[PDB]
Design an enzyme around this catalytic site. Structure first.
Site, mmCIF file in Angstrom:
data_model
loop_
_atom_site.group_PDB
_atom_site.id
_atom_site.type_symbol
_atom_site.label_atom_id
_atom_site.label_comp_id
_atom_site.label_asym_id
_atom_site.label_seq_id
_atom_site.Cartn_x
_atom_site.Cartn_y
_atom_site.Cartn_z
ATOM 1 N N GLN A 244 1.023 -1.287 -0.165
ATOM 2 C CA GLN A 244 -0.231 0.046 -0.009
ATOM 3 C C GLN A 244 0.810 1.203 -0.147
ATOM 4 O OE1 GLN A 244 -2.096 2.290 2.951
ATOM 5 N NE2 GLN A 244 -3.881 1.124 2.696
ATOM 6 N N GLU B 45 -3.870 -6.908 -2.028
ATOM 7 C CA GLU B 45 -5.220 -6.458 -1.801
ATOM 8 C C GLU B 45 -5.759 -5.553 -2.835
ATOM 9 O OE1 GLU B 45 -6.599 -6.504 1.138
ATOM 10 O OE2 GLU B 45 -8.376 -5.034 0.824
ATOM 11 N N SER C 204 6.549 -0.659 1.734
ATOM 12 C CA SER C 204 6.389 -0.436 3.047
ATOM 13 C C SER C 204 6.796 -1.637 3.983
ATOM 14 C CB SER C 204 5.151 -0.087 3.418
ATOM 15 O OG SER C 204 4.155 -1.195 3.664
ATOM 16 N N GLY D 227 2.499 -6.303 5.731
ATOM 17 C CA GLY D 227 2.615 -7.967 5.487
ATOM 18 C C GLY D 227 2.989 -8.086 4.149
ATOM 19 N N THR E 271 1.934 2.421 13.270
ATOM 20 C CA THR E 271 0.238 1.934 12.998
ATOM 21 C C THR E 271 -0.050 0.746 13.645
ATOM 22 O OG1 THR E 271 1.002 1.265 11.112
ATOM 23 C CG2 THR E 271 0.328 3.519 10.840
ATOM 24 N N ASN F 133 8.909 8.130 8.692
ATOM 25 C CA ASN F 133 7.673 9.142 8.526
ATOM 26 C C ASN F 133 7.826 10.219 9.297
ATOM 27 O OD1 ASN F 133 5.701 7.504 6.621
ATOM 28 N ND2 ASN F 133 6.536 6.038 8.250
ATOM 29 N N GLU G 147 27.257 5.377 -11.181
ATOM 30 C CA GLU G 147 28.255 6.289 -10.628
ATOM 31 C C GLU G 147 27.978 6.621 -9.171
ATOM 32 O OE1 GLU G 147 29.349 9.715 -13.373
ATOM 33 O OE2 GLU G 147 31.154 8.632 -13.366
HETATM 34 N N1 LIG Z 1 5.559 7.212 3.872
HETATM 35 C C1 LIG Z 1 3.972 6.467 3.780
HETATM 36 N N2 LIG Z 1 4.019 5.320 4.410
HETATM 37 C C2 LIG Z 1 2.773 4.602 4.199
HETATM 38 C C3 LIG Z 1 1.622 5.146 3.586
HETATM 39 N N3 LIG Z 1 0.812 4.278 3.444
HETATM 40 C C4 LIG Z 1 1.163 3.167 4.302
HETATM 41 N N4 LIG Z 1 2.476 3.366 4.942
HETATM 42 C C5 LIG Z 1 3.202 2.545 5.619
HETATM 43 O O1 LIG Z 1 2.753 1.208 5.695
HETATM 44 C C6 LIG Z 1 2.554 0.585 6.912
HETATM 45 C C7 LIG Z 1 1.329 -0.378 6.913
HETATM 46 O O2 LIG Z 1 1.226 -1.116 5.860
HETATM 47 P P1 LIG Z 1 0.601 -0.682 4.579
HETATM 48 O O3 LIG Z 1 1.085 0.170 3.501
HETATM 49 O O4 LIG Z 1 -0.873 -0.158 5.112
HETATM 50 O O5 LIG Z 1 -0.056 -2.043 3.821
HETATM 51 P P2 LIG Z 1 0.954 -3.197 3.248
HETATM 52 O O6 LIG Z 1 2.471 -2.788 3.659
HETATM 53 O O7 LIG Z 1 0.744 -3.592 2.050
HETATM 54 O O8 LIG Z 1 0.507 -4.372 4.187
HETATM 55 P P3 LIG Z 1 -0.631 -5.010 4.593
HETATM 56 O O9 LIG Z 1 -1.778 -4.159 5.155
HETATM 57 O O10 LIG Z 1 -0.639 -6.501 5.195
HETATM 58 O O11 LIG Z 1 -1.151 -5.395 3.111
HETATM 59 C C8 LIG Z 1 2.396 1.677 7.686
HETATM 60 O O12 LIG Z 1 3.157 1.475 8.966
HETATM 61 C C9 LIG Z 1 2.969 2.949 7.107
HETATM 62 O O13 LIG Z 1 4.225 3.147 7.695
HETATM 63 C C10 LIG Z 1 1.832 6.282 2.651
HETATM 64 O O14 LIG Z 1 0.925 6.641 1.953
HETATM 65 N N5 LIG Z 1 3.019 7.116 2.953
HETATM 66 MG MG LIG Z 2 -1.650 -3.173 3.039
#
Ligand SMILES: Nc1nc2c(ncn2[C@@H]2O[C@H](COP(=O)(O)OP(=O)(O)OP(=O)(O)O)[C@@H](O)[C@H]2O)c(=O)[nH]1
Ligand SMILES: [Mg+2]
Ligand SMILES: Nc1nc2c(ncn2[C@@H]2O[C@H](COP(=O)(O)OP(=O)(O)O)[C@@H](O)[C@H]2O)c(=O)[nH]1
Lengths: 430, 199, 237, 434, 58, 56, 200
Positions: free
Chosen positions: D11, D66, D135, D139, D174, D201, D249
Site C-alpha cells: 500500500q 489487496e 512499506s 505484511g 500504526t 515518517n 556512478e
Molecule cells: N510514507 C508513507 N507510508 C505509508 C503510506 N501508507 C502506508 N504506509 C506505511 O505502511 C505501513 C502499513 O502497511 P500498508 O502500507 O498500510 O499495507 P502493506 O504494506 O501492503 O501491508 P498489508 O496491510 O498487510 O497489505 C504503515 O506502517 C506505514 O508506515 C503512505 O501513504 N506514505
Molecule cells: Mg496493506
C-alpha cells in the site's frame, strides 16, 4: 610536412578539444562550414599540419574523438564548429566507465581499443611524414585516465621514434568532486611516466585562480577555463605553422627541457592576461610580458615554483619585435633570480620568436618550465592515496576486474621514486 | 585591438576655447555684433579677393575690441591657415565662430526673402526692408531700454547710408543668420522673424 | 557581422557571352553539366548578384535534364554586404534588363541548339521572371520564387504560358512577396483566365531555397525542387 | 538512452507511485490520458515507451495482494495511462504477516510478475537499474518485496537495484507487529539490494510542519516530497548539465564496503512561497540548510557519528564556482566531521532544469534545489532501536504462533537477529581511527 | 471627532482580486502541462544502438 | 546524393501493369497512409464491441 | 450530439444569409474548391458540370436544400461509419473546416478537483475550525447581506484560499453543484456540500 594528429578522450578531454579546434580554425580563418575565409596567404601555407584536404575545397581536422559513453559525442556535435569533425572518427562505447580505473583499463578499454587503434593507425599512414602525437585528457576521470593511458601504451609500442605530448588535468585537493580520484590519478601517473615524452600539468584550481583575480570576471564558467588552456595549447606549436626570426618545433623544446628522461613534467603559463576595463590602461611591451611570465600565480598548476628550482625553462614569443628585447630580458631575469635557478646548468633558458601575433593582440608569450617544485603536488596526491589504502576503502570495485593489490603497491613505490628523484636533483652542487 | 581605440591624430583639430571665448564675448556687444565682425572683414578687405594676410587679421580682431595675446593668434592661425599660404579665408572663420544654422531657420529665411520680393514684384530693395519691420520686436530677443524712435536709426545705421544698394538672397540670408548668433534659442529667433515681417 | 559564408558574396567567373545589340555583349555563366539535353532553362539571380550559391543551385537543376544559363544583369558587380546590396537593386534598370533575357533566349535557341526554353528566378529574379514572361515571346513556362514585379508596367493579363509560383506564409516583406499579395495575384490571373498555379509551403520564410543560411529549411526546399523539376519535365518538349 | 524500471509493492509503495508518476507525467508534458499535446529530442524514453500511435506507457508495474488499492488506480483519472494487465492485483492480503506474504500466498502472484518484468525488460536494451518501493512495516509489502529481490538476484544478476524502503518510526506507528517483519525483511535485503534509502515518517512529518507550516498534513503531502527526491536523483539521466552522473556512478562513490550500503537522504529547500518570495534562496544558503540534522528525512542525528561519503545533486541555475565555495564552508565547519580514511568525500552533480511545481501542491517555484544522499555511522542508531523492539517482543514469544502456523521455521527469528547484530557490530568497526 | 470610517479600518480581506503580491505567481491548478523547451540531454548518436541490427556481431 | 539506391526511394517499388501490385523483393514497408487505416479500424472495433455488450 | 454540433456548424458556414436553406450552386462550388487548387473561379457549363457533386440530396418545390434534409443525409451516412474520430475527420477533410470543442469536463476530474479543495481546508488550523474561516470571508464581502453567492465571487473566494481553479473547471463544479440553473449558489448549501457530505 611534419604534421601532428590530435587524440582526445573523456568528458574533460572532449570539451578541451571542442574549444581548442575553434581557436585554431579562427587563427587560420576556417568557418564553421569548413571553408577558408582568411586574408593573407600565410594562413594557407602550412594548413596541412592540422587539417586534411577534402573535396570542394573544404578542410577536415585529423582529430580522433573517443569516449566510453556516446552522450559526450552528441554534445560535441551540437556545439559551434561541430560540423568540421568527420563522422567516421567518432569511436564510442555504450556502457561507460563509472569513474573506475579498472573498468576503463581492463574490461571496457581492452575490448574497445581495437577500433580506435585502427583509426589512429589509418590517420598516421595518410601523412607523408608524421611529427608526433598530442593527447588531451583528465587524470581524475574513469575513461580519460583509464583507457587514455592504455592507448598511449599501445601507440608508443608501434611508433617509437615519434614524440608524444600530453595536456593532462589532475584533480586538486581544494576543488575536489570525486571520492575515488586518488586511486585512478596515481595509477595513471605511474603509467604516464613510463611512455609519455612530455607531460603538461593543468589544475582546475589554478584556472579558477587566474579567472577570479587576473581577469576579474565575477562568474566564470567551464567555457572560460577551456579558453585559457586552448590559448596555451596553440601557442606551443605556433612557430611550426608560421615563419619567424627563430624556428623551434616540438622536438626542439623536448631536447632543451629534458635533462633526464624521467623528468618530463612541465608547467605552462600564458601572457598577457588583462581585464576588460584595463586594456586601455596597460602598455604592451616585452618587459611587461616577461614580468608576468615568471609570476608565480600565473602558472596553471597548484605547485608554487618559488619553493623549488627551475631546472630548465623555455619561452615562445609571438609577434613582431627585435631580438634585443628578448635576449636582454631573459639574461636580466636569470641574473636577478639566481637563487631560483639551479647552478650546474648555466644559461638554462631558451627563447624563440614567431612574427604572427594572435587576432586582437600585438604580442603574446607561451611559457613552458621544468621545475622541481612540481614534486609537491605528487606528494599531496600520494598523501591522500595512502590515507585511503591502509583501510582498503573503495577497493572491491578495483579488485573486481582481476587487478590485484600488488599493482597498488607498485604504484606507491614508483610514484615515491619519481618524487625522490626530483628532490635529489634540486639538492645538488658542483 | 577591438577593445581599445587608438585615438591619436590624423587631422588638425579645431582649437576650441579661443573660439568659444570669442563667441561669448561677441554676445555682450549686442544683436548686431556678428554683423560688425563680418562688416569689418569686408571693409578691411577693400579689394574683394576672399582672403586676409597676417597683419590684416590682427587689425580686424583689434578693430572689434578683442586684445588677444600672441599665443591665441598662433593657435587660431594654425588651424585656419593649414599649410601656411600666408593668407586666411575669412569666410570659413566667420562661419565657425557663429555656430551651426538649423535647416528649419534657413528655410524660413529663404521664404522671407521671397515674401518681401512678392509685393515689389521679385526685386529686392533696401527701402522695402526699412519700410516694413517691427522695431518693437527688439525687446523679445533681448530686453532693451532704448526708445522705439531711436531704434529705427540704429537699424539703418547698421545698414548702409545709401538707400539704393542692391541686395542678393545670399547676402540677405547671411544678414539674419548673423543676428541669430546673438540669441541662444532657435525658437526665440523664429518668433522674432515672424513679428518683424508679419509672417 | 552578417552571416555570409563567402557563397552568396563571391563572384563566379563567367564563361559565355552574348550580344544584345542595343547594349552589346554581356557575359554569362553556362553550366558545364549535362549539355546533351535539348531542353533549356534560364536562372535569374537574386539581389546580391551572381555568387557561388546561385551557380551551385543552377548546377543542381542542370543535373536533372536541363541546360542552364545564368545571364548577367549587374555585369560584373557583386554585393559584398547588406547595406550596398540595396544600392545595386535600385540602380538596376528593368527596361535595360528585359532585352537581356530575350537575347539569352535567342542565344540558347540558336547557338546551343535548344528546342524549348523555360525561365526560373529567385526573389528579385522571380520578380524579373514574372516580368519576363509577360513582355517576352518564345517562353514555354516560368517558375517564380517569392517574387512579384510591378503591376501597371507589367500586367499579368498578358501572360500566355502556365506559371507555377512558390510562396511561404512566414514572409516579413510587405508589398513584395506577401502571402496575401500572392493570393491577390492568383485571383487576378484566374479572373484574367491565364493558367496560374500557386503553391504555399508551411513554416517557410523568405529565401527558403537558399542553402547554408539561417533562413534555410531543408524539408520545404526538397519538395519545391521536386515539384518544379517535374513540372518543367512534363511541360517542356 | 538510459531506461529504469520502477517496481511498486504494498500500500505504501503504490500510493507513493501515484505521486511520483503524477510528477513524471507533468514534468515531461504528458497529459493524464496519455497523449502529448501538439507543440536532443524527446528525452522521455527513460520513463515512457512510445506505442507508435501517440500513446505513452509507463515503465512500471504495481503489485499488491489487496484488491482495494488497485481499484481507484483503475477508477481514478489515470485509467487510460497504465497498461491494464501490468497492474497486478491479488486476491487476499497478507494481513501484516511476513510468513503469509513470503511462503503461503505470495508464491501464486510472483510468477505473473516475473513474466511482466521480463516482457517489459526485453523492450529496453540500455537498462540502467531497477527501483523498488515498499512499506517494510507491512505484511505483503515486506514479504513480496523480500521474495522478489531473491528472484531478481539470480534472474538478472549484475543489474543495479535501488530501494526506497519505509522503515517504521521510532516511537509511534500504526500496527503492533512492525518489529517482526521489519527485521525479517532487513536480513533479506542486506545481501540482495545494492542501495537502501531511509524514508521514515516522523522526520518527514516534522519537515512539513516546521517549514511548509501545515498543521494537518496527510499521506498525500508525504508522497509528493518523496516524489521530488526521486526526480532530482534521476534528473541527470534525462537533462543536460555541466556535470553528469548516472546510476552506476552512485555506488562507486557511496559504498566503501559491500556490507554497508545504507544511506539517509535530505532535501532542500523545502519551503512555501509565503517564506520563499521574501527569501533570496542562494546556493550557499540551501547547502547550509541541507546539512542540518533537523532537516533530515530519517529520524536520526548525524552529529552522533562520522560521515562516510556524501553525494549531492544540484538543479537549476547554479554555477560550479559557488558550489565549490559552499563546499569549503562545510569542511571548515566543525560540527560536521568525516572518517579518518576519507580525505575527500563529496560527489556533486549539476542539472540545468529547475524543479517543476505541481498544481495543487505545497512547494513553491524555485530556481535552485539540492538533494542529499549521505552515508554515516549514525544509521546504526535506528537498527538498534528495532533491536530493542524485538527483544521485548520475543522474550515471551508473543505473536509468534501467528508465524509458526504458516509453515515458517521457528529458527528464522534467531538467524535474522544474529545477522542484524553483526551489521551493527560492523558499523562501529568502520568508524574507528587507525 | 468621529472615527474616519468603519469601512476604512484594517480588514484581513478586501475586493482587489489578488490581495497580496503572493498569489500572483502560484501555478494555475487546472492548467495543462507544458513540454520543456530546448533543454535536455543530447540525443543524436544514441540511435544506432536501438536499431534492430546491432546484433549479428560477426 | 541524388538517385534511388542512396536515398531509399519509395516510388520505385511499383509494378508496371498495376497501381496496386508491388515488387516482391523491393518493399520498404507500409506507408503512413496505409498505417492510419489500421488504427482507424482498431478505434472502430472498440465502439463495435460496446454495441454487443449493450445487447447482452 | 457531437456529430450534430459539427454538421450544424458546417451548414452555417455556407448559410451566411440565415434563410435556413442554401442554393445548390454554393454547396457544389465548395466541394470542388477544397478538392482542387487549379479549378479556376469560373467554368463554361459550371452549373450542370458541378451539379453532379450535389443532388445526392433532395430539394423542395422552391429548389432549395432544407437544413433538415442536409442533416438527415449525413445521419443516413452516419450508419456505415462507427468511429466518431473517423466521421469528424471525414467531414473536416471534405469541407475544409476544422473547429471543434477540445473536451468537456468529466465527472472523474470533477471528483478530483472537489477532493483537492476539500483536503486543502483540512490542513489549515484545526478540525473544528475552517468553517468559520469560510464564513468570515463571505461576511467580509457579502455587502448586500442577502446570502446569495455569485460565480465571480467563487473565483475571488478560491483565489483567497490558495486554490486558483481554472475557469472551465470552476464552471463545471459550479454548474454541477446547483440545480436551480439561476447562476446563484446559496452559501450554506455550498458549505454543506464541501464539508458535511458522506461521499466524495
Ligand atoms: N510514507 C508513507 N507510508 C505509508 C503510506 N501508507 C502506508 N504506509 C506505511 O505502511 C505501513 C502499513 O502497511 P500498508 O502500507 O498500510 O499495507 P502493506 O504494506 O501492503 O501491508 P498489508 O496491510 O498487510 O497489505 C504503515 O506502517 C506505514 O508506515 C503512505 O501513504 N506514505
Ligand atoms: Mg496493506
Ligand atoms: N578544465 C576543465 N575541466 C573539466 C571540464 N569538464 C570537466 N572537467 C573536470 O573533470 C572532472 C570530471 O572528470 P570526468 O568527466 O569524470 O573525466 P572522464 O571520466 O574521463 O570523462 C571534474 O572534476 C571537472 O572539474 C572542462 O571543460 N574543462
Amino acid at each position: 610536412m611534419r604534421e601532428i594528429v590530435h587524440i582526445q578522450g573523456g568528458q574533460c578531454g572532449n570539451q578541451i578539444g571542442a574549444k581548442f579546434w575553434e581557436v585554431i580554425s579562427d587563427e587560420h580563418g576556417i568557418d564553421p562550414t569548413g571553408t577558408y575565409h582568411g586574408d593573407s596567404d600565410l594562413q594557407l601555407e602550412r594548413i596541412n599540419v592540422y587539417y586534411n584536404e577534402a573535396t570542394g575545397g573544404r578542410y577536415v581536422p585529423r582529430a580522433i574523438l573517443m569516449d566510453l559513453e556516446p552522450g559526450t559525442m552528441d554534445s560535441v556535435r551540437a556545439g559551434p564548429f561541430g560540423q568540421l569533425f568527420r563522422p567516421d572518427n567518432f569511436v564510442f562505447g555504450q556502457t561507460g566507465a563509472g569513474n573506475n580505473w579498472a573498468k576503463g583499463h581492463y574490461t571496457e578499454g581492452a575490448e574497445l581499443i581495437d577500433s580506435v587503434l585502427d583509426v589512429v593507425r589509418k590517420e598516421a599512414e595518410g601523412c607523408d611524414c608524421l611529427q608526433g602525437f598530442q593527447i588531451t585528457h583528465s587524470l581524475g576521470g574513469g575513461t580519460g585516465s583509464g583507457m587514455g593511458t592504455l592507448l598511449i601504451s599501445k601507440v608508443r609500442e608501434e611508433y617509437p621514434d615519434r614524440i608524444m605530448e600530453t595536456f593532462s588535468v589532475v584533480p586538486s585537493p581544494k576543488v575536489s568532486d570525486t571520492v575515488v580520484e586518488p586511486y585512478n590519478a596515481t595509477l595513471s601517473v605511474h603509467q604516464l611516466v613510463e611512455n609519455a615524452d612530455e607531460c603538461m600539468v593543468i589544475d582546475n584550481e589554478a584556472l579558477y585562480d587566474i579567472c577570479f583575480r587576473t581577469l576579474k570576471l565575477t562568474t566564470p564558467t567551464y567555457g572560460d577555463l577551456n579558453h585559457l588552456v586552448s590559448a596555451a595549447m596553440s601557442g606551443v606549436t605556433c612557430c611550426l605553422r608560421f615563419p619567424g626570426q627563430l624556428n623551434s618545433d616540438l622536438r626542439k623544446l623536448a631536447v632543451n627541457l629534458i635533462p633526464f628522461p624521467r623528468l618530463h613534467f612541465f608547467m605552462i603559463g600564458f601572457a598577457p592576461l588583462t581585464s576588460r576595463g584595463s586594456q586601455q590602461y596597460r602598455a604592451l611591451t616585452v618587459p611587461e610580458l616577461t614580468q608576468q611570465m615568471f609570476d608565480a600565480k600565473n602558472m596553471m598548476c597548484a605547485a608554487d615554483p618559488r619553493h623549488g628550482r627551475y631546472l630548465t625553462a623555455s619561452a615562445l614569443f609571438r609577434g613582431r619585435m627585435s631580438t634585443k628585447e628578448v635576449d636582454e630580458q631573459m639574461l636580466n631575469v636569470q641574473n636577478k633570480n639566481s637563487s631560483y635557478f639551479v647552478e650546474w646548468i648555466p644559461n638554462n633558458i631558451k627563447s624563440s620568436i614567431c612574427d604572427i601575433p594572435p587576432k586582437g593582440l600585438k604580442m603574446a608569450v607561451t611559457f613552458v618550465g621544468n621545475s622541481t617544485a612540481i614534486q609537491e603536488m605528487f606528494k599531496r596526491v600520494a598523501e591522500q592515496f595512502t590515507a585511503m589504502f591502509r583501510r582498503k576503502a573503495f577497493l572491491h570495485w578495483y579488485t573486481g576486474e582481476g587487478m590485484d593489490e600488488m599493482e597498488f603497491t607498485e604504484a606507491e613505490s614508483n610514484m615515491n621514486d619519481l618524487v625522490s628523484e626530483y628532490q635529489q636533483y634540486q639538492d645538488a652542487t658542483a | 585591438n577591438p577593445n581599445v581605440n587608438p585615438v591619436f591624430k590624423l587631422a588638425r583639430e579645431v582649437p576650441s576655447p579661443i573660439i568659444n571665448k570669442l563667441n561669448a564675448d561677441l554676445k555682450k556687444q549686442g544683436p548686431f555684433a556678428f554683423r560688425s565682425l563680418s562688416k569689418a572683414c569686408q571693409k578691411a578687405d577693400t579689394f574683394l579677393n576672399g582672403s586676409l594676410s597676417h597683419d590684416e587679421f590682427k587689425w580686424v580682431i583689434k578693430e572689434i575690441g578683442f586684445s588677444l595675446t600672441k599665443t591665441e593668434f598662433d593657435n587660431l592661425f594654425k588651424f585656419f591657415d593649414k599649410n601656411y599660404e600666408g593668407k586666411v579665408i575669412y569666410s570659413v572663420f566667420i562661419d565657425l565662430v557663429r555656430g551651426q544654422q538649423s535647416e528649419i531657420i534657413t528655410q524660413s529665411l529663404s521664404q522671407g526673402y521671397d515674401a518681401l520680393a512678392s509685393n515689389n514684384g521679385g526685386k529686392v530693395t533696401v527701402e522695402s526692408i526699412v519700410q516694413r519691420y517691427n522695431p518693437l520686436a527688439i525687446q523679445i530677443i533681448y530686453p532693451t531700454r532704448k526708445i522705439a524712435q531711436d531704434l529705427q536709426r540704429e537699424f539703418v545705421a547698421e545698414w548702409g547710408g545709401n538707400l539704393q544698394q542692391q541686395v542678393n538672397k545670399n547676402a540677405f540670408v547671411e544678414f539674419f543668420s548673423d543676428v541669430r548668433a546673438f540669441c541662444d534659442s532657435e525658437s526665440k529667433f523664429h518668433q522674432y522673424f515672424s513679428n518683424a515681417f508679419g509672417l | 557581422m552578417d552571416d555570409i559564408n563567402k557563397k552568396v558574396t563571391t563572384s563566379k567567373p563567367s564563361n559565355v557571352i552574348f550580344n544584345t545589340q542595343t547594349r552589346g555583349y554581356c557575359p554569362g555563366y553556362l553550366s558545364p553539366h549535362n549539355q546533351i539535353s535539348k531542353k533549356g532553362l534560364i536562372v535569374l539571380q537574386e539581389w546580391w548578384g551572381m555568387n557561388e550559391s546561385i551557380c551551385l543551385l543552377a548546377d543542381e537543376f542542370a543535373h536533372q535534364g536541363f541546360k542552364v544559363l545564368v545571364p548577367d544583369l549587374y555585369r560584373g558587380k557583386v554585393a559584398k554586404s547588406h547595406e550596398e546590396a540595396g544600392h545595386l537593386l535600385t540602380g538596376l534598370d528593368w527596361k535595360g534588363a528585359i532585352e537581356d533575357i530575350a537575347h539569352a533566349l535567342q542565344y540558347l535557341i540558336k547557338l546551343q541548339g535548344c528546342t524549348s526554353v523555360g525561365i526560373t528566378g529567385f526573389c528579385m529574379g522571380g520578380a524579373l521572371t514574372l516580368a519576363s514572361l509577360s513582355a517576352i515571346e518564345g517562353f514555354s513556362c516560368g517558375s517564380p520564387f517569392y517574387g512579384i514585379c510591378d503591376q501597371q508596367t507589367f500586367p499579368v493579363t498578358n501572360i500566355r504560358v502556365p506559371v507555377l509560383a512558390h510562396f511561404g506564409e512566414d514572409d516579413s516583406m510587405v508589398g513584395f512577396s506577401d502571402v496575401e499579395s500572392a493570393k491577390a495575384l492568383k485571383l487576378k490571373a484566374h479572373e484574367a483566365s491565364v493558367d496560374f498555379r500557386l503553391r504555399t509551403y508551411p513554416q517557410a520564410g523568405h529565401a527558403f531555397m537558399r542553402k547554408e543560411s539561417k533562413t534555410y529549411q531543408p524539408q520545404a526546399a526538397a519538395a519545391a525542387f521536386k515539384e518544379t523539376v517535374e513540372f518543367f519535365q512534363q511541360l517542356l518538349k | 538512452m538510459r531506461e529504469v524500471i520502477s517496481i511498486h509493492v504494498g500500500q505504501g509503495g503504490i500510493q507513493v507511485g501515484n505521486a511520483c508518476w503524477e510528477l513524471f507525467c507533468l514534468e515531461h508534458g504528458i497529459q493524464p490520458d496519455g497523449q502529448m499535446p501538439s507543440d536532443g529530442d524527446d528525452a522521455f524514453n527513460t520513463f515512457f515507451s512510445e506505442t507508435g500511435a501517440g500513446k505513452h506507457v509507463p515503465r512500471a508495474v504495481f503489485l499488491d495482494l489487496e484488491p482495494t488499492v488497485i481499484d481507484e488506480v483503475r477508477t481514478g483519472t489515470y485509467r487510460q495511462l497504465f497498461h491494464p494487465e501490468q497492474l497486478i492485483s491479488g486476491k487476499e492480503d497478507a494481513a501484516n504477516n511476513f510468513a503469509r506474504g513470503h511462503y503461503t500466498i505470495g508464491k501464486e502472484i510472483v510468477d505473473l510478475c516475473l513474466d511482466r518484468i521480463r516482457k517489459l525488460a526485453d523492450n529496453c536494451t540500455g537498462l540502467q537499474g531497477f527501483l523498488v518501493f515498499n512499506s517494510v512495516g507491512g505484511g505483503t509489502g515486506s514479504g513480496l518485496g523480500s521474495l522478489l529481490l531473491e528472484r531478481l538476484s539470480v534472474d538478472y544478476g549484475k543489474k543495479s537495484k535501488l530501494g526506497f524502503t519505509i522503515y517504521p518510526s521510532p516511537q509511534v506507528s500504526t500496527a503492533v507487529v512492525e518489529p517482526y517483519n521489519s527485521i525479517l525483511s532487513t536480513h533479506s535485503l542486506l545481501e540482495h539490494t545494492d542501495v537502501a534509502v531511509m524514508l521514515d515518517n516522523e522526520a518527514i512529518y516534522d519537515i512539513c510542519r516546521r517549514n511548509l507550516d501545515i498543521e494537518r498534513p496527510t499521506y498525500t503531502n508525504l508522497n509528493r516530497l518523496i516524489a521530488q527526491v526521486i526526480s532530482s536523483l534521476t534528473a541527470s539521466l534525462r537533462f543536460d548539465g555541466a556535470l553528469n552522473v548516472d546510476i552506476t556512478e552512485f555506488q562507486t562513490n557511496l559504498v566503501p564496503y559491500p556490507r554497508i550500503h545504507f544511506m539517509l537522504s535530505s532535501y532542500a529547500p523545502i519551503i512555501s512561497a509565503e517564506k520563499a518570495y521574501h527569501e533570496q534562496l542562494s546556493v550557499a544558503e540551501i547547502t547550509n540548510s541541507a546539512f542540518e540534522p533537523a532537516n533530515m528525512m530519517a529520524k536520526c542525528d548525524p552529529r552522533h557519528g562520522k560521515y562516510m561519503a556524501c553525494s549531492m545533486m544540484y538543479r537549476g541555475d547554479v554555477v560550479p564556482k559557488d558550489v565549490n565555495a559552499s563546499i569549503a564552508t562545510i569542511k571548515t565547519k566543525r560540527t560536521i566531521q568525516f572518517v579518518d580514511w576519507c580525505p575527500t568525500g563529496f560527489k556533486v552533480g549539476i542539472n540545468y532544469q529547475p524543479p517543476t511545481v505541481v498544481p495543487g501542491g505545497d512547494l513553491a517555484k524555485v530556481m535552485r534545489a539540492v538533494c542529499m544522499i549521505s552515508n554515516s555511522t549514525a544509521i546504526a542508531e535506528v537498527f538498534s532501536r528495532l533491536d530493542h523492539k524485538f527483544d521485548l517482543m520475543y522474550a515471551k514469544r508473543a505473536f509468534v504462533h501467528w508465524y509458526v502456523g504458516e509453515g515458517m521455521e521457528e529458527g528464522e527469528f534467531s538467524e535474522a537477529r544474529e545477522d542484524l547484530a553483526a551489521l551493527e557490530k560492523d558499523y562501529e568497526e568502520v568508524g574507528i581511527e587507525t | 471627532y468621529t472615527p474616519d470610517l468603519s469601512a476604512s479600518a484594517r480588514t484581513f480581506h478586501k475586493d482587489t482580486i489578488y490581495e497580496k503580491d503572493y498569489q500572483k505567481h502560484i501555478p494555475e491548478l487546472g492548467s495543462k502541462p507544458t513540454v520543456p523547451k530546448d533543454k535536455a540531454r543530447p540525443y543524436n548518436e544514441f540511435t544506432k544502438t536501438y536499431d534492430s541490427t546491432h546484433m549479428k556481431i560477426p | 546524393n541524388t538517385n534511388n539506391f542512396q536515398t531509399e526511394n519509395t516510388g520505385t517499388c511499383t509494378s508496371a501493369f498495376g497501381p496496386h501490385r508491388v515488387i516482391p523483393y523491393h518493399w520498404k514497408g507500409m506507408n503512413p497512409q496505409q498505417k492510419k487505416d489500421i488504427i482507424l479500424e482498431q478505434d472502430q472495433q472498440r465502439h463495435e464491441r460496446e454495441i454487443l455488450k449493450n445487447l447482452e | 450530439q457531437r456529430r450534430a454540433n459539427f454538421v450544424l456548424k458546417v451548414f452555417d458556414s455556407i448559410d451566411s444569409e440565415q434563410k435556413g436553406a442554401v442554393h445548390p450552386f454554393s454547396l457544389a462550388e465548395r466541394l470542388e474548391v477544397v478538392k482542387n487548387k487549379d479549378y479556376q473561379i469560373g467554368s463554361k457549363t459550371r452549373e450542370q458540370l458541378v451539379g453532379e457533386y450535389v443532388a445526392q440530396f433532395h430539394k423542395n418545390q422552391d429548389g432549395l436544400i432544407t437544413r433538415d434534409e442536409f442533416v438527415s443525409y449525413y445521419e443516413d451516412l452516419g450508419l456505415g461509419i462507427s468511429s466518431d474520430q473517423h466521421f469528424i475527420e471525414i467531414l473536416q477533410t471534405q469541407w475544409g473546416i476544422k473547429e471543434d470543442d477540445d473536451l468537456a469536463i468529466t465527472k472523474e476530474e470533477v471528483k478530483g478537483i472537489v477532493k483537492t479543495i476539500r483536503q486543502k481546508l483540512i490542513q489549515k488550523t484545526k478540525g473544528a475550525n475552517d468553517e468559520f474561516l469560510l464564513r468570515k470571508l463571505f461576511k467580509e464581502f457579502d455587502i448586500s447581506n442577502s446570502g446569495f453567492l455569485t460565480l465571480d465571487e467563487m473565483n475571488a473566494m478560491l483565489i483567497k484560499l490558495e486554490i486558483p481553479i481554472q475557469k472551465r473547471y470552476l464552471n463545471a463544479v459550479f454548474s454541477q453543484l446547483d440545480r436551480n440553473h439561476s447562476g446563484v449558489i446559496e452559501f450554506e448549501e455550498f458549505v454543506y456540500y464541501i464539508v458535511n457530505d458522506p461521499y466524495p
